[model samples]
Target: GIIATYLIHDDSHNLEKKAEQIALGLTIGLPHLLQEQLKQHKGNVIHVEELAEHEHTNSYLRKKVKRGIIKIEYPLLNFSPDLPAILTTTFGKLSLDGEVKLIDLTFSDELKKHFPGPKFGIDGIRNLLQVHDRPLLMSIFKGMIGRNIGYLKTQLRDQAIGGVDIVKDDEILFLTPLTKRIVSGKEVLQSVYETYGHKTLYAVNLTGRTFDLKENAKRAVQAGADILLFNVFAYGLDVLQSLAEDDEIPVPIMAHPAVSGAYSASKLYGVSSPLLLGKLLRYAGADFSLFPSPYKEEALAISKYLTEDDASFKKSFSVPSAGIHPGFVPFIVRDFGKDVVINAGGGIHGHPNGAQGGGKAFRTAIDATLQNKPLHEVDDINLHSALQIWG
Candidate 1:
């Protein structure tokens, strides 16, 4: 028997059996040896979210089954479909109820090809920023509102001229304030876009009441912004799914976690692992996502350290930010490799010289990581200048 087989089901009509099957898969056929494995990983210490057993038959197909195979009886679920089902496997003898949800597998060959994730990564990002063999730096527009649109554009131009590859709006900041001239997110994007063009990527925030988030995303895309950030937990998952599948919207998305606290606030009570935020969000459609760095004051309480040796910590473009800097790149690169987005807020801004210098410092820090060189030993050059914010 193979160790595992993915089971797919749709009990839109029969949800009670779906729950029963899940329970049976936990109680049956596995001997004590398999049960021991389950004991070690109990509670919300693993990735398991019981979404009120899918009971909608109008299109609500929710079902389950036992995944026991001393040998292959059936071929498991046929992994084919444009938006195929969420494949899950069951394990025995962990809880009094007894079972663990292994991986929330998605069946998409198309996504797999482009996203083993960026191999060249921050280096590739640096290349896009036109910085060679150096760290990749970024800048953010500070103060959520109050700043004039023209002034904000100049702030962006200053950072771009000084060499920031990725300049995004602060996650909480709104480009579309209630003012007359700066009427919408589009107006603010347009105000700054002509000056910087595509030289710098902007991720405007679009978290509104459920009805407005999709429209906000559309408005920004129509204005030609390359990226938008959304908190799916705040808006709605259906709204996010719609945005990801929309062909008219050409820009990729960056997902942020504001209300994600609802699920990760406790260990035994809520979702145990980063899978909900890291993998599930990516599987949904976010091209990039940011979590607090462990060194920061607000590191992910859910996952303090990610060991490359662990299956859970596999390659994903889930970024680590909040007080991160070029100095920590060596540790992150060595442990997690190049597949990460190291976001630094004050680390870039507090460069002594100002935001422009902060941008250079950040850009340089990333280059050092790709080259597997130390931040102190990086060669001095034009790209290096963009990163040398402090010295």
Candidate 2:
């Protein structure tokens, strides 16, 4: 049985009728099968076994609206081991209907077992990187789209030398040359470590149509890519799950929040951002998930995306991105605690000194916060430069 909470926003219609509509609308009610035929296909039927009125709230029209919880007894046979089938059967057709919002989806333990969650979560990633106490620092490759191999290697070396834990490509860089780039990128990181004596993990962005995503991930992993970056919103949660669960390619999967705003930005109509990026992504095997910070114009409540439930089995790290600087590190650490990834793109590359200064500044901030020393007390030139520029 899958329990779904829905906010019924049709004040013009009777609350009871709207609830009934959602109950039937999401399940066997719309198929209009005959009584005998329904009995014959009973195994396929998703029975809306329960509907109860929940807390009431004011609608956009200022009229009192009703919330309802619907318990759907969907047969296991109706679902494949994929997210699309589950999502489609749960809310696909009904979403087109007016103003009914799916507040939450809770699956039975049996169904939960079907999905393999994160392969390498918080502790796993920490062990791989050999850093534990402080939050991990991740830097994005800025302006690498048209750059030559020499430029890519230089940027990679500088950031690695400056001490960023994981470095990922810009989300927009994808397809065609991806495999070759990933192969050469790992070699570049290797070269950087040999000279600089500091290790950095490089995650190749896995993007494209959903059809080719799995193959792309497999190829990158085969070519010895350290990590994988997936635009979960652009592709799908299950696609991330497929890559994370693949034993042949066991590497950490990073979830990027691209195009999720269409569904998450709405206050009333669509699912909440936390469910989409946090709980759902964690369930779908994303080891690290990136979300917009409260500092950004489109701020998300930081606590909403951090779940202790996920930490029970596999620990997924939350990364708050966009306009993140050294000054904001303490706020993020306070909100998300140690098992988080502090990701900076422009914040790092935009440093007065350069990418190296930016990476060192972020690392300095993380160290200061972890050591209980004030940022001002530590007094490092790189951090001071970053604080002056972005503070």
Candidate 3:
């Protein structure tokens, strides 16, 4: 395995105030058993690739340096001042034999002490959904902001015909008031669900004002939603932890990056630390989380990949999105592998043949990945309509 490094950006003043505690670990000391563990490994060095101190993803913090740390097991969790107190618990314990000044510190796998891997991870999610071989094809029914539930249902059926395995409500479009039919989230869900059954998976939005969000989550489930979607920052980690552990909920949860920008912005505050969003989200119980791909629209998708699949923490099935098209599936597979989900939004809807054709193209692209066929050759089958676009 390779090392994955992350950046923690915050303000200079605040970071100076907080640096004492950060440096405090050097005094409190590591468990003696753990200290011996670091000396026993091959301890190879991995180069640092990128640095970030952005606001939306918890990068901002007293203008603190956005550093990168790489080791064999936990790839990218180099700590600076860009994260919350509870979140840095993982970073505080890991050992750095060489100079700790460089953001690119190295740790060993022998140090994977009490760290949790993944629960109901890739294999578990696949088994729960009974999908195999091919990538789990899913689409969020997004379009015409004010459309009625009827419009959504019709489009969903069209996507299902095009072979979409899962469908979700756009978290942004979840409960806005100025829409057609004035349908409540519960009503819109039950009506469409009454029509589709479990033929497709629906990641229903269950986030709102803090006090009401959980019940909203419960209502969506009652109305037949297959999965739950929530903005983790808006809802808080403790709440998310409870949701993931609740047997009464039984269904899975999906974390959205709605307001996490603040944490990733400063060298501190909030939860934009890569591993928490990537690994901890799953360990906390999200069967899957949407970590947008670092493609044209999002250039830093690999951060989520680093925290999720590549890190030492529990793995979460990644859903790569943001301007991803059928043309890019092979590269994504080459980078992240088949255990991930490919979300083609505008990339699917903007196709020349419309949504159905766009969807078919994406499905075909995924098949090509599983078969190890090149992207251009994916259109060999009639099922792959998007290949004609590249031709």
Candidate 4:
């Protein structure tokens, strides 16, 4: 049995009644004996602001969407293989109906066989880098649009030299000629390692038509690409899963939050952050799932989903994004905890000493936080350079 959890805001005041209808409505299963309500919360109504009124804000005609939480134990017989099938069976038409949010999914032990998670998850990635027990730092290429390999190679080397574990292509970059770009990235990183003895994995942006992805990824890997950064929502979870399960594409995958915001951003209507960007992303085999840094309380939930033990499945890294700098590392480490990939874009490229100093400062910050030292008190040159501006 797969226990699918949901948060529903319906006109029905009675949760049990609504719950029964929901189960019954799925494939017209009249009185499903296997169906059992694990938990139910029938909360009273409150003002749910409409998505540009989804709100006919008139006090006279008010049928507020009553709140309720439910966990239904659905039989495995109703489902087949893949995420699409699971979503369709559990929240297919249900999502279209009223304000229903698919919050969590409990796949039975038997069902787990179908979905295998990340290939080179946390431990694998750590092993590959030969650096453990510290937060792995990452950065993206700045000004990638309409840029040539000469400029990007220099950018890659600077970030790597200053000590970033991973360097990903800008999520928005898709100018094609990916093979040449990937080879250039590898050449830069290889020389950087020879000079600084620092290894940085370059994750090239894997974008194009859906049909071209498998071939593109294979070609990218052949061209010395370290990792494949995919806009998961741009394709689909099934598409991402396909890439993960594919043995030919041996590198780790970084799932970017492209169309994901519109799906999980709103608490009032859409899916929750932990379930979409967390559990589902891991289950779909994302080695690193990137999203906006969160409220500490809610942040832990996503962290748990990504890093939690499954025995059979390996843990993926949870990446918090946007405006990360040297000073911000302390709070980021505290709030998101250790098992994370610290990611930044402008934060690394916008420093006084350029990408070299910006990345160096970020690494310095992480080390300071781990050693119980304060950023302000640290006398590191890179950190001082960063603190002069961001502080």
Candidate 5:
């Protein structure tokens, strides 16, 4: 049985009446204490019981309502096998009827065993890049609406020269095959590595009809692709989980938050930020999860991963998205701590000296942050240049 926490509103405004109506639309749970024996047991035979219930004026709409923490067990009898089915059983009629918004769910060990977390989590990716002890920086590929392959090469060349740890495709631009695109992109990174001794991974944007996802991902990796950026919300969480769970794919998947806000950014509807983007994303297998806001505390909550699959909660990198620049690195580091990936697009590309300078500028800022110093006191021209222009 799962314990679900939810916010319920009833026009009748009576908790006793709505509690029964809620049982009519949705169900709540059970327990025992034959003699202090409940804590040691872990099975559905325990029965469902109402954990807690209260009436409060938790006004998202200027009214008082009921908040319930019900022990609603969908159990592993096929009704609780996956997310869609789970949501259907938990909130199917209740969701459509309105007045109810799901807050969180407590997964039983039986149900949790079905899902997988990140394979190459923080430590694994850090090993691949051999970059430890400092937070890494990432840059995005821009202006690809009508750009040619040569433009992509140039973009990679500069970003790599600037020494960004990862460079990723921001959105869909299906002008070339993913294999061809990544293969050519790899050559640029290789050239930069040989010339100046810096390495960077590319996170190719993955898109298309849902049915073709896995095969296309297999194709991309077969041709030497390093990472993938997936639109998890548009397709579905199950779809994202399937990709991360596959043994043959062999690449880190980055979950995109493009179409997520419609459900989450509302006043009285949708799920929460920490559960949807933070916990659920990692649990479903995103090696890296990006959100739209600064998400300071949110990042701290989920960036904790690795060992035997069932025994450990492998962490995921929390990417707080914004038009962040080198100057903000101090605050970003202080706020997000060491594990966050500081992502930027125009901030790096639009620097005065070049993308190379922009990357170096951010590096110094990070160093300043970690070493307990300030950017103004650091003696780097690139840092000064970034401050000159972006300040």
Candidate 6:
């Protein structure tokens, strides 16, 4: 059985009518169902567990607003053997049918067994990196689209030398010339490992058309990539889970929020961003999940991915990214705590001196915060410069 929370914004119908309509619309409510068919399945239709009007908010009109908890028995609706099938069956056409929003889904233990969740979650990843005391600092490769192998190697070396714990390819750069025209991801990872020796872990992007995602993931892991960056929205959450659960490719998977806004941005309609990017992605085995911060237009959604007591397994390290810079380090640490990952692309690569300086500056800021020292007291010129610019 699956317990789903839904919000119905109906002004035309009363609470009872709205609830009945939603229950039927989600299951066996289509006009094509005959009276005999309804009689045949009358005993097993979806159950509307609860319904209550929205009485605590003033943001919207005081119209006929109601929230409902619906229970769908697994046997009534024929479900496929995968996550996508279950998701679509529950919220597929109903999302566009009316002013209805699927707020959350509570899975049963039987359903939980099908998903392996994250193999390497927050603690496991910290163990791999051997830096458990503070939040891990991650850097992204910038201007990588047209760059060559030599340039890629230099950027990786500089960030590693500057002491970033993890490095990922820019999410948009897929099958670059360095990995295709000159060398493979394995060669790149080998070159970095031989020189840096794990000072920084590299996460190659595992993105392409939907047809070959699995093959590309296998190829990347086979080539000795330490981590994989997946645009979970661009691809599908189910695909991310498959890579996370694959025993042959046991590295951590990082989920980038490239197209998540389309689903999470709206408040009245669509799924909430936190449910998609936070709880659902973590449940789908994303070891690290990146979401926009409060500084940007999308704020407060970061909390959805933060560690929660109700989490079944170890939580994925939350990354409140996009427009992230050194100056925001203290606030981020304060908001998310030590279990988070501070991720920045141009935040590091756009420094006055370049990627190296940018990385060093970020490290300095993080170090000061961890030591309980003030940022202004830091003496590094790069740190000072970054503060002046992005602070």
lDDT tens readout by residue for model 5, 1-391 = 5555555555555545555555444432235664345333222222222323333444444655444333333445436568787677666776776666665666677777888888788887787787887888899887766888998899888888888999998665657678877999999998988898877999988877999999989888999989989989999889999998999998899888888776666534566556677767777888888876452554444343212234445777767788588888887777667877888765787887778888889887898889988888889999998888877
Collision count for each candidate, in order: 16, 0, 44, 0, 6, 0
Q: How accurate locally, in lDDT, is each candidate?
A: 0.48, 0.74, 0.54, 0.80, 0.73, 0.72
Candidates in order, TM-scores: namely 0.59, 0.84, 0.64, 0.90, 0.85, 0.82
Which candidate achieves the best lDDT against the true structure?
Answer: 4
List model 3 lDDT by residue over 142-217, tens digit each: 6747776667667766666566667677655532332222234335444544675534566666756777766766
Least accurate stretch of 10 residues (summed lDDT) in model 2? 41-50
Q: Indicate which candidate wins on TM-score.
A: 4
lDDT of 4 by residue, 154-254 (tens): 88888999899999877565544878888777888889888888889988888779999999999998888899999999899999999999999999999
Better of 3 and 5 by lDDT: 5
TM-score of 1: 0.59
Candidate 6 wrong stretches, greater than 4 Å = 28-81, 174-198, 296-306
Better of 1 and 3 by lDDT: 3
Model 3: lDDT equals 0.54
Clashing pairs in 5: 29-48, 29-49, 30-48, 30-49, 305-314, 305-315
The TM-score of predicted model 2 comes to 0.84
Off by over 4 Å in 1: 1-136, 174-198, 296-316, 378-391
Models, CA RMSD each: 12.2, 5.0, 9.1, 5.2, 5.2, 5.0
